[PDB]
Amino acid sequence: RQEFEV
Amino acid sequence: RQEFEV
Amino acid sequence: RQEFEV
Amino acid sequence: RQEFEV
Amino acid sequence: RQEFEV
Amino acid sequence: RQEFEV
Numbered sequence: 001r002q003e004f005e006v
Numbered sequence: 007r008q009e010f011e012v
Numbered sequence: 013r014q015e016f017e018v
Numbered sequence: 019r020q021e022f023e024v
Numbered sequence: 025r026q027e028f029e030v
Numbered sequence: 031r032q033e034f035e036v
Contacts, residue, residue: 019029
């Protein structure tokens with residue numbers, strides 16, 4: 001899965 | 007912390 | 013995973 | 019401390 | 025990992 | 031102390 005976070 | 011996974 | 017932090 | 023991983 | 029600090 | 035690692 002693709003994921004992004006800060 | 008920033009992170010990214012494809 | 014790619015990650016960045018300060 | 020700043021860090022980066024690809 | 026790449027890192028920098030003062 | 032300043033430090034750097036690649």
